[PDB]
């Protein structure tokens, strides 16, 4: 584990992360997709061999020795708010299990279901709180990646508020 497990946020491409493994914001079919998923496909395409997995689950595929944890958040276009919320929390709990199983000391993670799966809603707080629920009991250093300056500030504030 990390000597003093922390949360941090960076405003940059998660495909350029400085952590021991990455979480993909995957689609259920293991397709190259859009946004984070497409960046992950360009950087670690070998990790999309048999990466298909249902909504609410995580499946890790190694690119060389570098683990890519494919986490499938719900598309809120398809799900009700209530069921979407349930599957989003579940995806993060599976991420925590995989991070634990891999024995990594750090992980790069995007906010699941906040992009084209958001159903046109701002889900920063919803997604981040489910990330914290799952990851708080892990001892990996977590680095959250975002692209928007206002999101970086809001995520940073949320991390600092817990101390």
Q: Which residues contact 113 (CB under 8 A, 6 or more apart)?
A: 25, 73, 74, 75, 76, 84, 88, 91, 123, 127
**CA-only gyration radius of the chain, Å:** 14
Contact pattern for Cl ion over residues 47 through 66, marking x by CB under 5 A:
--------------------
Strands 66-71, 58-63: parallel, antiparallel or unpaired by DSSP? antiparallel
Contact pattern for Cl ion over residues 79 through 118, marking x by CB under 5 A:
------------------------------------x-x-
Q: What is the nearest approach in angstroms of Cl ion to the Cβ of residue 2?
A: 24
- Pick one of 10, 93, 97, 147: the residue that binds Cl ion (CB under 5 A): 147
Q: Where are the alpha helices (DSSP H) in the chain?
A: 36-43, 81-102, 124-135, 149-161
Q: Is 13 annotated as a binding residue?
A: yes
Q: What is the nearest approach in angstroms of Cl ion to the Cβ of residue 70?
A: 13
Residues that bind Cl ion (CB under 5 A): 25, 115, 117, 146-148, 151
């Amino acid at each position: 584990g990390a000597m003093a497990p922390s949360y941090r946020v960076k405003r940059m491409d998660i495909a350029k992360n400085d952590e021991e493994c990455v979480v993909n914001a995957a689609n259920p079919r293991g397709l190259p997709g859009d946004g984070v998923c497409k960046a992950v496909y360009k950087k670690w395409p070998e990790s999309f061999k048999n990466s298909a997995t249902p909504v609410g689950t995580a499946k890790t595929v190694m690119c060389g020795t570098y683990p890519v944890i494919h986490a499938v958040g719900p598309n809120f276009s398809n799900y009700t708010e209530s069921e979407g919320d349930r599957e989003l929390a579940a995806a993060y709990r599976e991420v925590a299990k995989e991070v634990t199983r891999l024995g990594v000391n750090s992980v790069a993670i995007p906010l699941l279901s906040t992009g084209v799966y958001s159903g046109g809603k701002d889900r920063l707080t919803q997604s981040l709180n489910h990330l914290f629920t799952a990851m708080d009991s892990t001892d990996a250093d977590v680095v959250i990646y975002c692209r928007d300056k206002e999101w970086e500030k809001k995520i940073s504030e949320a991390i600092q508020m817990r101390t």
